[PDB]
Enzyme design. Structure first.
Site, PDB file in Angstrom:
ATOM      1  N   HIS A 153       0.801  -1.231   0.000  1.00 56.97           N
ATOM      2  CA  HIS A 153       0.000   0.000   0.000  1.00 56.97           C
ATOM      3  C   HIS A 153       0.832   1.279   0.000  1.00 56.97           C
ATOM      4  CE1 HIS A 153      -3.869  -1.910   0.433  1.00 56.97           C
ATOM      5  NE2 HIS A 153      -3.587  -2.431   1.614  1.00 56.97           N
ATOM      6  N   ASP A 192      -3.355 -10.621  -2.079  1.00 57.63           N
ATOM      7  CA  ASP A 192      -3.904 -10.048  -0.859  1.00 57.63           C
ATOM      8  C   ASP A 192      -5.330  -9.560  -1.125  1.00 57.63           C
ATOM      9  OD1 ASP A 192      -4.451  -7.500   0.765  1.00 57.63           O
ATOM     10  OD2 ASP A 192      -2.753  -8.285   1.892  1.00 57.63           O
ATOM     11  N   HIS A 194      -6.845  -6.912  -0.455  1.00 56.30           N
ATOM     12  CA  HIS A 194      -7.033  -5.484  -0.678  1.00 56.30           C
ATOM     13  C   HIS A 194      -6.286  -5.044  -1.926  1.00 56.30           C
ATOM     14  CE1 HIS A 194      -7.585  -6.292   3.646  1.00 56.30           C
ATOM     15  NE2 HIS A 194      -8.617  -5.478   3.498  1.00 56.30           N
ATOM     16  N   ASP A 283      -4.961 -12.693   3.841  1.00 56.38           N
ATOM     17  CA  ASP A 283      -6.193 -12.116   4.354  1.00 56.38           C
ATOM     18  C   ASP A 283      -7.362 -12.282   3.395  1.00 56.38           C
ATOM     19  OD1 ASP A 283      -5.145 -10.322   2.492  1.00 56.38           O
ATOM     20  OD2 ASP A 283      -5.316  -8.579   3.831  1.00 56.38           O
TER      21      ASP A 283
HETATM   22  C1  LIG Z   1      -8.868   5.475   2.789  1.00 58.61           C
HETATM   23  N1  LIG Z   1      -9.783   4.786   3.694  1.00 58.61           N
HETATM   24  C2  LIG Z   1      -9.756   4.859   5.062  1.00 58.61           C
HETATM   25  C3  LIG Z   1     -10.718   4.061   5.597  1.00 58.61           C
HETATM   26  C4  LIG Z   1     -11.000   3.873   7.060  1.00 58.61           C
HETATM   27  N2  LIG Z   1      -9.987   2.967   7.591  1.00 58.61           N
HETATM   28  C5  LIG Z   1     -10.379   1.556   7.594  1.00 58.61           C
HETATM   29  C6  LIG Z   1      -9.213   0.625   7.304  1.00 58.61           C
HETATM   30  C7  LIG Z   1      -9.502  -0.794   7.794  1.00 58.61           C
HETATM   31  C8  LIG Z   1      -8.283  -1.476   8.409  1.00 58.61           C
HETATM   32  N3  LIG Z   1      -7.069  -1.163   7.655  1.00 58.61           N
HETATM   33  C9  LIG Z   1      -6.424  -2.056   6.871  1.00 58.61           C
HETATM   34  N4  LIG Z   1      -5.299  -1.636   6.273  1.00 58.61           N
HETATM   35  C10 LIG Z   1      -4.643  -2.556   5.556  1.00 58.61           C
HETATM   36  C11 LIG Z   1      -5.076  -3.869   5.410  1.00 58.61           C
HETATM   37  C12 LIG Z   1      -4.410  -4.871   4.519  1.00 58.61           C
HETATM   38  O1  LIG Z   1      -4.384  -6.065   4.803  1.00 58.61           O
HETATM   39  N5  LIG Z   1      -3.939  -4.375   3.378  1.00 58.61           N
HETATM   40  O2  LIG Z   1      -3.490  -5.200   2.348  1.00 58.61           O
HETATM   41  C13 LIG Z   1      -6.256  -4.168   6.071  1.00 58.61           C
HETATM   42  N6  LIG Z   1      -6.951  -3.287   6.795  1.00 58.61           N
HETATM   43  C14 LIG Z   1      -6.725   0.262   7.663  1.00 58.61           C
HETATM   44  C15 LIG Z   1      -7.940   1.140   7.956  1.00 58.61           C
HETATM   45  C16 LIG Z   1     -11.398   3.449   4.489  1.00 58.61           C
HETATM   46  C17 LIG Z   1     -12.457   2.551   4.375  1.00 58.61           C
HETATM   47  C18 LIG Z   1     -12.888   2.157   3.118  1.00 58.61           C
HETATM   48  C19 LIG Z   1     -12.282   2.654   1.972  1.00 58.61           C
HETATM   49  C20 LIG Z   1     -11.226   3.545   2.060  1.00 58.61           C
HETATM   50  C21 LIG Z   1     -10.793   3.930   3.322  1.00 58.61           C
HETATM   51  K   LIG Z   2      -4.686  -7.563  -4.016  1.00 55.78           K
HETATM   52 ZN   LIG Z   3      -4.636  -6.870   2.803  1.00 52.66          ZN
END
Ligand SMILES: Cn1cc(CNCC2CCN(c3ncc(C(=O)NO)cn3)CC2)c2ccccc21
Ligand SMILES: [K+]
Ligand SMILES: [Zn+2]
Ligand SMILES: [K+]
Length: 402
Positions: A153, A192, A194, A283
């Site tokens: 990311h 992954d 995401h 994940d």
């Molecule tokens: C930019 N932006 C910020 C949010 C609110 N934050 C929620 C997330 C949920 C939790 N989180 C997160 N990060 C990385 C991973 C991973 O595995 N990445 O490969 C998974 N989970 C960060 C925060 C959000 C929700 C939906 C779409 C975009 C949005």
């Molecule tokens: K991916």
């Molecule tokens: Zn992820």
């Protein structure tokens, strides 16, 4: 000629551990040692013609080893941030620092809050992935495996999704510059759960690196990007691919669509393809608390076998990285079977065989593969202690597209 598979481990497997998944590296290495490696070898006292268990020497990396992608000011800030505020006390390992206003410019807020050890964690991650790329480029090397990398990311000057420095991008750039400039095309397949938005951003205009991301997509699904319409810009038009899946998608959706997308990616790159970079986050497996999909271990294994089979048949190179994954046992299960596939694949190649997976169980049809009792974490794999066992689904399973 060296052993065809390099497994990048290091002397301190906690060096790259992140605060929220601090034990995960331990589960993964434990499963590699007891599930994936034994049949290919006779842990620093292991002999193998198939793999090399790499503990030394990890390159010392700094800001200048990351400027190939990242803004220098951003990297300089990461390098000194732990001197700029106190640990927040208002008892987790690697605890958060007090936020300061200068964090905001770089996205070092919310899930990307600075913490003690951050720069050391970033260094160990980049060091391992750069070492993986360098060993992969050597003649005779089929694959290099760094489960501790995959910070997909991170963007040029901003953090995101727990990612500060994008070792996927840095590893792509390093591997490419060590391949013959005649044939150095790279395919990056990100499974992954995401969107691989950081990697995509780095190569958006680029026609020599094809980024392909499978991910959940929809309202409330981080990071909100990666729709089917994102196809790249300029010379890079056509060399960005996204497979956005509906929340809860199962194997029948993800495996089918990714098989189609991968084959199209193979056609797009043609004979310029030198290497496949795999960003394998667990994940996407059913039961994950932060991913939003319902793939099985055998489903992910099958997507990746398509990539392994192609690189083996064409004598290409495979760089295998981790990524997300928020159930330690699921992460280790998937890493064990994928690593054993790579080892079985590499051993078959050296023996000139055309079947590549004869020494590693396909979990799609062997439904009784045991978790090895010798695993240090064996008792965590209940109630049934099979390699394909997953937690109950968190989001409802989807077998058809709307
Ligand atoms: C930019 N932006 C910020 C949010 C609110 N934050 C929620 C997330 C949920 C939790 N989180 C997160 N990060 C990385 C991973 C991973 O595995 N990445 O490969 C998974 N989970 C960060 C925060 C959000 C929700 C939906 C779409 C975009 C949005
Ligand atoms: K991916
Ligand atoms: Zn992820
Ligand atoms: K591209």
């Amino acid at each position: 000629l060296p052993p065809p598979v390099a497994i990048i481990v290091g002397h301190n497997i906690d060096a790259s551990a992140m605060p929220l998944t601090y034990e995960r590296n331990r589960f993964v290495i434990d499963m590699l040692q007891h599930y994936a490696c034994p049949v290919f070898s006779h842990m620093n006292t292991v002999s193998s013609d198939v793999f090399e268990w790499v503990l030394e020497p990890f390159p010392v990396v700094g800001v200048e080893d990351m400027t190939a992608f990242h803004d220098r000011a951003y990297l300089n800030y990461l390098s000194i941030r732990e001197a700029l505020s106190e640990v927040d006390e208002r008892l987790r390992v690697l605890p958060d620092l007090v936020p300061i206003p200068a964090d905001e410019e770089y996205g070092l807020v919310n899930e990307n809050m600075p913490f003690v050890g951050m720069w050391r964690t970033i260094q160990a991650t980049v060091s391992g992935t750069l070492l993986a790329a360098r060993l992969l480029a050597q003649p005779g090397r089929f694959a290099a495996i760094h489960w501790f990398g995959g910070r997909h990311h991170a963007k040029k000057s901003t953090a995101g999704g727990f990612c500060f420095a994008n070792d996927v991008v840095l590893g792509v750039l390093e591997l490419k510059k060590l391949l013959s400039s005649d044939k150095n095309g790279i395919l990056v397949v990100d499974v992954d759960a995401h969107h691989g938005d950081g990697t995509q951003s780095a190569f958006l205009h680029d026609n020599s690196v094809l980024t392909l991301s499978m991910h959940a997509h929809g309202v409330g699904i981080f990071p909100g990007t990666g729709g089917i319409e994102e196809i790249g810009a300029g010379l890079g038009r056509g060399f960005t691919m996204n497979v956005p899946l509906p929340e809860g998608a199962t194997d029948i959706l993800a495996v089918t669509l990714m098989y189609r997308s991968i084959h199209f990616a193979f056609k797009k790159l043609g004979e310029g393809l030198a290497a496949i970079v795999i960003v394998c986050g667990s994940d996407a497996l059913s039961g994950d608390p932060l991913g939003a999909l319902n793939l099985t271990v055998g489903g992910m294994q099958s997507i990746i076998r398509l990539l392994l089979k192609e690189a083996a048949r064409r004598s290409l190179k495979v760089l295998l990285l981790g990524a997300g994954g928020y159930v330690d046992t699921s992460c280790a299960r998937l890493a064990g079977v994928v690593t054993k596939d790579v080892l079985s694949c590499a051993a078959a190649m050296r023996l000139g065989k055309t079947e590549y997976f004869g020494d590693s169980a396909n979990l799609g049809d062997n439904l009784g593969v045991a978790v090895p009792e010798g695993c240090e974490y064996f008792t965590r794999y209940g109630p049934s202690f099979l390699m394909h066992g997953l937690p109950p689904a968190r989001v409802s399973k989807l077998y058809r597209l709307p």
